[PDB]
């Protein structure tokens, strides 16, 4: 090998709740584990989480999932959940940070090898198509290393930044998704993105529905309370699908307001008057002044639909093992590859994540991947060594950036992607506008192939990382777009204007984007719990 090789049993790519819980379990099992994180682990988006009979929990989760949540996966989560959480106790709020802090401290104690500020590039395959590690760069030095592994565990989190407005930290660029896709590994339910109808425009910080509950309402650029047109009875308290969609129709048909926040609708609160706002929405007043730079007491809050959670991802078993399909359309495990957390689609969330289960799945399925790793390694058997060209294949994308100093600005490409996704593939999904959108996305991705990297330096070259992240935004966005156009029904977070109803006859199923032909197929929803009869629709 020309490239330096670091060998471990497991290589965990990502140090949020999910990846750190898995790494802790792997190291506790006696096995050698490398933990990679592009940021110091306590700066994972997990840090943003706040707030802190099992069959009831299961029922709520299946129901909330609109019945494309896998019942066996959900049962495992709800039953095992409480044990899993207390195991951690036995070792803005601090709830996200404390989870990260504990898992970080434990990983060190149990001699997990931590590679903080290292950026994973692409999965390494062998001649048989098994995953045998990844290539990653040291952000401090620019050194590139092949992390050779029997098990490679993707735990990279979400990808809200495919859209213009997200609650997600800017590190959330879908790197695991891009990595899976380019390796030929499918992704599931990528149309299932949870949106909030009103985040602060230019920020993405959520503005509570309580603002509308209190009497607030939405204005377009003419000061028309436009929800009266789209929802004559419910108005600004209509379903979140309707309120969010309506805002984007308004923006895309030119009636959006604009200014330094970019395009938006105005959330008018000032008619409520000073005392009730300070009494009943004192937090919204401070959030607005700081991040919208407006005082709601006098001016409306600029808002726009905002992307929160990725229910889709790499399909997995309860064991963390990543799945694909064969030409019979049957599940078959991808040897050497695993996924845990928000990057995964085990599918405890189906069509709509339910509050608290996003922290819970991290620990339950983080741990389960670790608990079963040895058995999974035994299942896949000894994997052949990656050859030198196998490793070089995983560097190709990197090499193209490093040989293009002149060409198109990636920042502009990113903004075009995000606008396209927001206009055509967020909360307004309609067949004609999506057909155009898909073609626009092909134009944008041809431009990304002639995109420049200005900074040729090796040490702390952020621009190179940001360029590499854009390739992953582009893959995650295109998969989402193709999936969204495919599912001709409305279910949960996927709302279609041209197909407003839920269709259990044709679409009680998962969507599955197949990267080798970029085409779609379906996969069955598990309806077979072990301890409990199935919950029917």
């Amino acid at each position: 090998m020309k490239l330096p090789v670091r060998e471990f049993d497991a290589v965990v790519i990502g140090a949020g709740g999910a990846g750190m819980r898995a790494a802790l379990q792997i190291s506790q099992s006696g096995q050698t584990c490398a933990l990679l994180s592009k940021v110091f682990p306590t700066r994972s988006h997990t840090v943003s989480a706040q707030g802190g009979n099992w069959e009831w929990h299961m029922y709520d989760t299946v129901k909330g999932s609109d019945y494309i949540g896998d019942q066996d996966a959900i049962e495992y989560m709800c039953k095992t959940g409480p044990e899993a959480i207390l195991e951690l106790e036995h070792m803005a709020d601090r709830t996200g940070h404390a989870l990260l802090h504990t898992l970080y401290q434990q990983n060190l104690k149990n001699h997990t090898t931590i590679f903080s500020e290292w950026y994973a590039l692409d999965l390494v395959k062998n001649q048989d198509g098994a995953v045998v590690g990844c290539t990653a760069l040291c952000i401090e030095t620019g050194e590139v290393v092949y992390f050779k592994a029997r098990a490679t565990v993707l735990a990279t989190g979400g990808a809200g930044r495919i859209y213009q407005s997200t609650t997600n930290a800017h590190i959330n660029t879908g790197d695991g998704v891009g990595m899976a896709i380019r390796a030929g590994v499918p992704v599931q339910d990528m149309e299932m993105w949870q949106f909030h109808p009103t985040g602060i425009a230019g920020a993405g910080v959520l503005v509570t529905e309580g603002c509308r509950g209190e009497g607030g309402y939405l204005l377009n650029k003419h000061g028309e309370r436009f929800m009266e047109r789209y929802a004559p009875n419910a108005k600004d308290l209509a379903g979140r699908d309707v309120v969010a969609r309506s805002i984007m129709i308004e923006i895309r048909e030119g009636r959006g307001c604009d200014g330094p926040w970019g395009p938006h609708a105005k959330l008018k609160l000032d008619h409520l008057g000073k005392e009730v706002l300070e009494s009943r929405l004192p937090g919204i007043l401070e959030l607005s002044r700081t991040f919208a730079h407006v005082d709601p007491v006098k001016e409306p809050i600029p808002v726009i639909p905002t992307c929160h959670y990725m229910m889709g991802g790499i399909p997995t078993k309860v064991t963390g093992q990543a799945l694909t399909v064969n030409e019979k359309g049957e599940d078959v495990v991808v040897p050497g590859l695993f996924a845990v957390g928000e990057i995964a689609c085990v599918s405890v969330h189906g069509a709509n994540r339910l509050g608290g289960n996003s922290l819970l799945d991290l620990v339950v399925f983080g741990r389960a991947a670790g608990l079963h790793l040895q058995e999974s390694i035994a299942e896949q058997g000894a994997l052949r060594d990656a050859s030198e060209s196998d490793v070089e294949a995983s560097l190709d994308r990197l090499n193209r950036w490093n040989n293009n100093r002149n060409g198109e600005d990636p920042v502009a490409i990113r903004k075009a992607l995000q606008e396209c996704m927001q206009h055509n593939f967020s909360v307004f999904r309609e067949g004609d506008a999506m057909a155009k959108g898909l073609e626009q996305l092909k134009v944008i991705r041809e431009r990304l192939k002639n995109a420049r990297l200005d900074d040729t330096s090796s040490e702390f070259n952020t621009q190179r990382v940001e360029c590499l992240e854009l390739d992953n935004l582009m893959e995650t966005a295109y998969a989402t777009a193709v999936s969204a156009n495919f599912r001709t029904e409305s279910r949960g977070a996927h709302s279609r204007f041209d197909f407003p109803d839920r269709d259990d006859e044709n679409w009680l199923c998962h969507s599955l984007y197949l990267p080798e032909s970029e085409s779609m197929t379906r996969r069955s929803v598990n309806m077979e719990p072990k301890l409990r009869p199935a919950f029917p629709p």
């Binding site: 988006h45 997990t46 500020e117 425009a201 230019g202 920020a203 702390f460």
Partner: protein, 86 residues
């Protein structure tokens, strides 16, 4: 090393959207306007935990360190001066 601007730029990538908006533009637009002492204080600030940084920026408590306080106040003042982030 206050001159290693590339290193400090990476330390501005956080786990909260609110901090990305609050710190990264400040660093990009304002870091070179700072004295040598201010620059060292900003670097030490970024070692702090994300929820503390958010709270202090929101006037929900304050660090127990006079230098970090004035740096928080500085970021707040400068961020109000720049207005919404493009």
């Amino acid at each position: 090393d206050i001159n290693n601007k590339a290193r400090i730029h990476w330390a501005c990538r956080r786990g909260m959207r609110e901090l990305d908006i609050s710190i990264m533009p400040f660093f990009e637009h304002e870091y070179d306007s700072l004295s040598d002492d201010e620059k060292r204080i900003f670097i030490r600030l970024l070692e702090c935990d994300d929820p503390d940084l958010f709270n202090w920026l929101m006037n929900h408590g304050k660090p127990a360190d006079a230098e970090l306080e004035m740096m928080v106040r500085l970021i707040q003042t400068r961020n109000r001066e720049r207005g919404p982030v493009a």
